[PDB]
Design a protein around this ligand. Structure first.
Ligand SMILES: Cc1cc(C)c2c(CP(=O)(O)O)cc(=O)[nH]c2c1
Ligand SMILES: [Zn+2]
Ligand SMILES: [Zn+2]
Length: 229
């Protein structure tokens, strides 16, 4: 099922959806996997999240060329940390239109990231303002509230059973909530639950650091976050 392509791993999740995985050393603590998504929408490809680095992200584009062979119309990135935005320059070099939460773009320079070209803004109920996400096809972008970071956003794939929680959601057996350095611990539980409520049909939950899981990833993440309050 997993396809090794250089130093990256690709896994098909649905007829038009693949998960990309890349790795970065955290010195003294080992190699950390990060996952994003690749979606074919008719004659074009849409990407969710970069890899950790420009070189890895260019390799994602190379895999897309060889295994899908359609233009990448856009990429959306889900917060201003390296695992999700570290390859922005590679997307720009490839001519790909890039989108992030306005707050992610504001935070990008101080986080050592390059901002996306375009900023998403969100209604008070969390749904993206549609004019800021033109041509997103089946991608439905939702801001669930502050959690893993204040800017974290999430993405559902219409026409599939898949929703992507990024670094907000951990798997159903996870022992911790991971890196809380930029987290909002008071609001985390509610934000995890809001993600679940936004995508009630999503039975396959994709996330940044574990294989896809059932919706027990959402309940378990929220229950762990209850303890932070
Ligand atoms: C201090 C720190 C910062 C980050 C961004 C990480 C990440 C990326 P993430 O916070 O987006 O998951 C993974 C990790 O394992 N440790 C970290 C430590
Ligand atoms: Zn993060
Ligand atoms: Zn993460």
């Amino acid at each position: 099922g997993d396809q090794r392509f250089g130093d990256l791993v690709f896994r098909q999740l649905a007829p038009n959806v693949w998960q990309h995985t890349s790795y970065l050393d955290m010195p003294g603590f080992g190699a950390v996997a990060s996952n994003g998504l690749i979606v074919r929408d008719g004659g074009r490809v849409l990407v969710v999240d970069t890899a950790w680095t420009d070189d890895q992200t260019a390799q994602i584009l190379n895999w897309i060329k060889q295994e899908i062979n359609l233009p990448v119309a856009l990429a959306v990135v889900t917060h201003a940390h390296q695992d999700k935005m570290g390859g922005m320059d590679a997307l720009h070099a490839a001519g790909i239109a890039t989108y992030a939460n306005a707050l992610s773009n504001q935070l990008a320079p101080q986080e050592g990231m390059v901002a996306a070209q375009h900023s998403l803004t969100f209604a008070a109920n969390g749904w993206v303002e549609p004019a800021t996400a033109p041509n997103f096809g089946p991608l439905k972008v939702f801001y669930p509230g502050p959690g893993h970071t204040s800017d974290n956003i999430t993405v559902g794939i219409d026409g599939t059973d898949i929703a992507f929680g990024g670094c907000l959601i951990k798997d159903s057996k996870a022992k911790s909530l991971g890196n809380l350095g930029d987290a909002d611990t008071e609001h985390y539980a509610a934000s995890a639950r809001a993600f679940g409520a936004a995508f009630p049909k999503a039975s396959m939950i994709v996330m940044s650091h574990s294989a896809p899981d059932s919706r027990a990833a959402i309940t378990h993440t929220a229950r762990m976050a209850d303890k932070l309050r």
